[PDB]
Every structure is written in C-alpha cells, then in structure tokens.
Design a binder for these strands. Structure first.
Lengths: 182, 286, 50, 50, 50
RNA sequence: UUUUUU
C-alpha cells in the first residue's frame, strides 16, 4: 500500500540483610497468592504471613520466633511448595529423638516423607528427607546426587551453632551449600 | 431518564453469555418503552446465546424493525447472513455501504460484512478497504481497535501489522491475542533486545497468574540463553497460572534437564505425558 | 546425540538432526560441576572418598 | 576429617573455608573496599616527581 | 592474617608424620580410609593398620 | 551432677 500505508502509519502514531518490619507491611495476603499451596485449619498470624509472602518468590527468610509451633507453619508451607514444583526438600534437626515425631507428623500431614539417621533409613527416595546435620555434612563432601534436586534446606534449631563440640558442623554446611539451594 | 436508558441498552448489547443474556432480556423488559429500534440491537446481543433466546431475539428484531430500522434492519440482515452462509452478505454489503455513507457508523457494518465475507470471498477492496476506513475512523473507547487488530491478521505489510499489533494491544488490553501475536511477530523480526523489555513490563503489572502467555514466552526467552534459574522460575509461574497445559510441563522438564536435575525432570516429563498421551516426545524423554 | 528441532514459532519437532556434544571427558571423580555424569550407580548416600 | 576432605579435592583449599567462616566475619567484612582502595591508591603514588 | 593458619600447618605436619599425606599434601591410602569414617578416624585407622 | 551426634 502507498496511500493506505501513510493512512495507517499516521493513525498508529548493598545491604544483604533486610529487616522486614514486624507488624506493618502485609495488608493483602489473599489478593496475591489466591491458590495457596497449603491449607490450614486457622488463620496465619502476621509474621507467618510475611514469611509465606517471601517464600513465594524463592527468597531465603530467617525466621526468629519464640514458640516452636508458630514456625512449623513456614516449615510446612515450604514443603507444600516443594511438592507442587516437583523438587525436593531437606529438613535437618540436631537431636536424634526430635526428628522422629517430625517424621510422623510430616508423613501424616502429606504424602512421602523419608527419614535418615544413624540407624533408621526409611525411604531414601521421598521428597522430604529428614536428617541430622552430620549426614548432610557428609553428603555435601561427596556429591550424592541428591543435591541436584534441592530447593529448600530448613535448618531447624540454628542456635546450636553456639555449641562447643558441634557448632562447626553448622558452618561447614552453611559454607559448602551450592547457590541454587534456598 | 435518558442517560441511564442508553447505558442499560449498551450493557445489554455488550454483556456476557446465556445467564447474562437472560439478564439482558430482563433489562430490555425493565426498559420496555418507545424507540424500539434498540430492542433489535438487544436481539443481536441475544443472538450471542442462540438458546431459547435467539428465536425470541429474531421475533423482537422483526417486531421492532417496522418503520425504517435503517441501520437496524441492515445490521439484522448482516447478522442473518453470519448465521447462514455468505450469500446474504453480498446483498447486505452493497446496500449498507451505498446507503449509509460514513466511516465510523459505517465501520460497524464494515466489520459485520468482513466477518460474513471472510469465509470465502477474497475481498481485497470490499472489506479490506472497509477495515482501512474503520482504522481511519478509530474511536475513543473500545470501538475500532479490534478492527485494526483483525485487519493485520497474517499479511498486508506485516511491519505496520507489528505496529498496529503494538497499538491494538496497548489500546485493547483484555485480549491475549494481539499482544501475543505482537511479541511473536516482533521476535520473528530481527530485533531481540526489545521483546525482553516488553515482557518485563507486561509481567510487572501481572497481579497473580493470569499472564501465562507472558510467563511462557519469557521462560522460553531465558531458555534459549543459558540462564536456567530465571527460566525455571518463570515457567513455574506459568504453570501456576494453568496446571493443565502440557507444553508448559514439557518445556519446564527440558529446563530442569538442561541444568543438573534428573529425577525432577523425570517427574515433570511423566506428568506432561500423563495428560495428552499422544505426544511421543515426552514418553521418549522419560 | 541426534537432538530434535523446533519450529521457530509454535514449536513443533520438524526433524531430528545430529549435533556435537560438548561436555564429555568430564567425570564425577575429576570435575565438580552440575554437568558431570550422574554417578557410578545407586550408591551409598554419604561416606564416599573418590 | 575437614583437612582430609579438602586436601583430597584439588580446586578447593583449606584456607577458603577459614576465610569464609563466621569467626572471621569482622575482619573479612569489607574485603572489596580494601582491594579497590589498594588498586586506586597505587595510582596515586604514581604522582610524585623523582 | 588468618588466626588459625599456624594450627593448620601443625595439623598437616602431624598428618604427614603418620603415613596419611605425601609431601606437598596429596592423600595416601590411609588418608582415604580415615576420610570415610564416622568417628575417631586417627585411632581407628591406626588400630586397623596395626 | 544435667545433656549429646556421625
């Protein structure tokens, strides 16, 4: 086109640690995230809402709360996202007896949850392996091909870094972790 | 009561499907008054449902179109031509174009005639020039952008088609054809560092999902380059938009397999083949 | 490897063409990247020298 | 065991881990500022007459 | 500057006086045995070899 | 005189 061509073209023309506010930010938890990966029997509180809001974007939170039962909402929303994306997640606890009922509760709440300890080795093929940190430190030094599929590593009781004979394990782990693992 | 009546009639004409079609019938009854030449337009809207309402719509249009129904009778004949084959269209186009000589009021009859004619007629001057006149008659609100989009479908100087795709997506936002076509044909063109800017901008105003057409393209754009982290995140967002499209699952599986992951790629490919079991590539990849 | 082809728009496998692999001669006991071959076999999870 | 598992690998040195430890964080916090200050004060010495 | 560097040097010497590390730090067979061991690596591998 | 893991 010659006259139509003109008649159409004339019409066409650093900080690295962000201290998120305790009480203020979240006003719209349901405007975005309308299809939550996990459904509770109650309402998530303010800090649990903020942690979930950052877990959606594949960030790396550092929750520091008082009671252990307020934190496990974050620790199982991360496992619901891991099961939604087909990836894998590692939950690591220091005490051998604490990581048994966690196995029971995570297997009762959803799907497949393997457990690895000094003697137990239930289902080393699931997507929610529960371990003691000395086993993750031992399979980070070799490859172990489980590290190829991780998304989240949920360090459970991170105030054991202060221990005198085991505080070096938490820092060998936090140093040797590759970059694609939140 | 004048301003409200016109708004109600326009809403009835422009409303949703059969339940809203019944709502439109209720609105027409609520505004059962003089100037019945709008009822036929409501009838045309009722034809958008064609279930227990088109027959009433046909009767309502026939009843209303009594004295002249000049625009209404020609438009109704064009609608009948659309329901039938393009035979009636040849008569309607000539009569409407000869009688109502305009560009913007004529643009509605031009779009109806082009929709009837597009079946078989070539129409290099009857409808294509009609769409050109409709593009010269570009209205302020939601009345002539879709015509320009439909005018630039596959041919006729695709470079201005890319320009009026960008304009037809900038003006008309709800549709996810002109924008997708615009970015696709643009990336078909030489320039590459321009598609990414468009996708980033569209993604920013994406509230929660409902932009799968954007997420998917940008994920592929990151997959052609070696940027697997961004590609994986983008494709995960696209699948959260709609977790049934096998193309997304297959492309995400390829993304996982490009970088390390082997059993997560396996899981995604199995899910991709599980639905749409016709695709051989997915089962082979598993 | 005989990799697939993709139609540049609305990708469909036109045909399979052979291309050159690039990350061979990499092994699990001499390279530390996520491109090395997976491993020997099903294997002990931890405690593995070499 | 740490020394053995790092001597074993060739591209990793044991001093990498000591540099990256939390007990070295105060000393090693501003390393990029030290290196840029070094490279930009070496320029300033090139000034004085001989 | 590293506070623990001399202790690393002393550990490497203790390793090399037993037969676990060659000169210039390359792991020997005894080193790879004590590498993949749970606890008391030095004493257990010494008991085994003796 | 409490507590613990490869």
């Amino acid at each position: 086109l010659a006259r139509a061509s003109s008649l159409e073209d004339l019409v066409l023309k650093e900080q690295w640690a962000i201290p998120v506010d305790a009480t203020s930010p979240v006003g719209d938890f349901y405007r975005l995230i309308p299809q939550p990966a996990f459904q509770w029997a109650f309402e998530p509180d303010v800090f649990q809402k903020q942690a979930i809001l950052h877990l959606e974007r594949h960030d790396s939170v550092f929750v520091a709360a008082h009671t252990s039962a307020g934190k496990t909402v974050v620790a199982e929303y991360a496992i619901a996202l891991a099961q939604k994306h087909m990836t894998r997640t590692i939950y690591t606890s220091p005490i051998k007896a604490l990581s048994n009922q966690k196995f029971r509760d995570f297997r009762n709440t959803f799907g497949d949850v393997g457990l690895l300890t000094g003697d137990v080795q239930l289902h080393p093929e699931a997507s929610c392996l529960i371990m003691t940190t000395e086993i993750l430190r031992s399979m980070l030094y070799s490859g172990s091909d489980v590290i190829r599929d991780l998304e989240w590593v949920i360090f459970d009781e991170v105030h054991y870094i202060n221990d005198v004979e085991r505080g070096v394990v938490w820092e060998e782990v936090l140093i040797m972790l590759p970059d694609h693992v939140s | 009561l004048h301003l409200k009546a016109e708004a109600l009639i326009k809403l009835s004409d422009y409303d949703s499907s059969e339940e809203a079609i019944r709502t439109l019938d209720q609105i027409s009854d609520a505004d059962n008054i003089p100037g019945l030449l709008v009822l036929k337009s409501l009838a045309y809207r009722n034809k958008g449902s064609f279930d227990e309402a088109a027959k009433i719509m046909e009767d309502l249009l026939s009843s209303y179109p009594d004295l002249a129904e000049v625009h209404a009778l020609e438009a109704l004949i064009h609608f009948t031509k659309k329901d039938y084959l393009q035979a009636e269209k040849c008569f309607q186009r000539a009569l409407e174009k000869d009688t109502e000589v305009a560009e913007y009021h004529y643009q509605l009859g031009l779009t109806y005639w082009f929709m009837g004619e597009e079946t078989r007629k070539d129409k290099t001057k009857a409808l294509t020039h009609f769409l050109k006149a409709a593009r010269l008659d570009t209205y302020m609100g939601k009345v002539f952008c879709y015509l320009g989009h439909y005018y630039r479908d596959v041919v006729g100087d695709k470079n201005r088609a890319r320009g009026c795709y960008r304009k037809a997506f900038e003006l008309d936002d709800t549709d996810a054809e002109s924008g997708a076509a615009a970015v696709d044909l643009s990336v078909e063109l030489e320039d590459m560092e321009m598609a990414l800017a468009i996708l980033t901008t569209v993604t920013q105003k994406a509230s929660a999902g409902t932009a799968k057409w954007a997420w998917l393209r940008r994920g592929l754009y990151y997959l052609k380059a070696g940027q697997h982290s961004q590609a994986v995140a983008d494709l995960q967002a696209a699948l959260r938009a709609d977790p049934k499209d096998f193309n997304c699952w297959e492309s995400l599986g390829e993304a996982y397999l490009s970088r390390g992951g082997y059993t997560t790629a396996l899981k995604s490919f199995t899910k991709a083949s599980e639905l749409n079991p016709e695709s051989i590539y997915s089962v082979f990849k598993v | 490897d005989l990799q697939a082809q993709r139609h540049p728009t609305t990708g469909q496998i036109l045909g399979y063409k052979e291309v050159l692999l690039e990350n061979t001669n990499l092994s699990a006991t001499t390279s530390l990247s996520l491109r090395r071959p997976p491993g020997p076999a099903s294997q002990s999870l931890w405690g593995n020298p070499t | 065991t740490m020394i053995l598992n790092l001597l074993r690998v060739d591209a990793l040195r044991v001093e990498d881990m000591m540099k990256r430890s939390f007990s070295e964080f105060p000393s090693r916090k501003d390393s990029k500022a030290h290196e840029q200050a070094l490279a930009e004060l070496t320029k300033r010495l090139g000034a004085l007459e001989e | 500057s590293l506070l623990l560097l001399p202790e690393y040097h002393q550990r490497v010497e203790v390793l090399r006086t037993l037969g676990y590390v060659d000169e210039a730090g390359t792991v020997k067979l005894a080193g790879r045995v004590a590498c993949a061991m749970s606890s008391h690596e030095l004493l257990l591998t010494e008991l085994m070899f003796d």
